[model samples]
Target: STVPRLHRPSLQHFREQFLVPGRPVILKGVADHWPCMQKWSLEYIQEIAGCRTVPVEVGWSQTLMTVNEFISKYIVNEPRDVGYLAQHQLFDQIPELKQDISIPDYCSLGDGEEEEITINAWFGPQGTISPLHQDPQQNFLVQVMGRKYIRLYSPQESGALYPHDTHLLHNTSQVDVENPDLEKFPKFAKAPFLSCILSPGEILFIPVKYWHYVRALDLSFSVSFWWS
Candidate 1:
């Protein structure tokens, strides 16, 4: 199923149509003005943060590596293990890069003060997966480089998604959304969802508590802003 698509929607329209209704939408041209759209190549990122140490994920294990090393070893070449710089406060660590992008004005519609907004970076090679999970705040997932395949399910489908039984993963679905083992997760087959290929310079608005599964279609760099 397709989500609503908008071209430079006004903040009021966004609040009325998507935010207040808790619906998801694909926004084009939202990041057309971000400096990162033109300046965030691998070479540039490496130049600015080559020696900076950051956390990276290989499968389920997290390790520390320099930004340049991550690009050279994992992003530029295929590796035995998937390497991902997932959900890191990269902007906070490298404040200089923060000036390249801006927060959407719609985020102010949330109850919390503007200072409460949180930004996180997600950068990785092709095929990296985030699994199926939900966040507690409204999200504006901006694609800064390459592409990604995203699937979103409404919170109402929690029963069909089979949220994990354990406390640690309670907000995550047990089913492998890409290739589910029906025998083990039959209910997952019944879950209704919307899928999209998020390209560079686009943003996807994911309502708070929505379940989303993400996979990189190519070497990708994305930033997510979460606001209450």
Candidate 2:
């Protein structure tokens, strides 16, 4: 089915209801007050940090390019290859841009220190894909621009969702969430999943070790805070 969407749940309520059970939930409009909710756009980013070199993942290789150059080539003109500014500590690189966003109050509910929480940025054109993978820590995935379609499977379903044998991608599944090879990965047919489409201002809390797949449906920008 779908993840339950809640509004302004207190830290105690969130912890007692969701975190304690290791369940996923959507905190609706939780980031509506952030200045980035209003000020962050492609044009604004270009003007603010145009020359700054950012790492983009094209297949397995990482390439360094300026923000403006990234926008012009991959977003506006459309390159044949997919180039995504994926999971970079963009806030640390551009502290000026960090001023526009604030730490979510829910981070206080975790056992880790607030300062230790790692925040990363994801930006890319439509069709950007993050295949099914699981993170070791709890995550608050915040969407700022465009929409992201997400599919999630619980850790217990690992048998049904076949993971890679490689040491590098052992946490990542080999079966494509969208187009699965039923013949090769037949167990995937019985895996139960929850799906959601995250839009601007919405935040999805992904519990630790939950298998999830993400696809950006438009030119998208997302900020993810991960804490163990």
Top lDDT: which candidate number?
A: 2
Candidate 1 lDDT over 110-141, as tens digits, reads: 89887778999999999999889999999999
Candidate 2 residue-wise lDDT, 1-228, digit = tens: 899999989899999998988899999767977898889889999999899999999867999999998898888985878889999999999999899887888988878998899999999999999999999999999999999999999999999988899988999999999999999999999889999999999999999999999999998999999996
Q: In model 1, what are the clashing residue pairs, if there are any?
A: none
Off by over 4 Å in 1: none
| Model 2 / residue 208 / CA error / Å | 0.5
Error of 1 at 109 (Å): 0.9
Relative to the true structure, how large is the alpha-carbon lDDT of every model?
A: 0.91, 0.92
Candidate 2 structure, TM-score to reference:
0.98
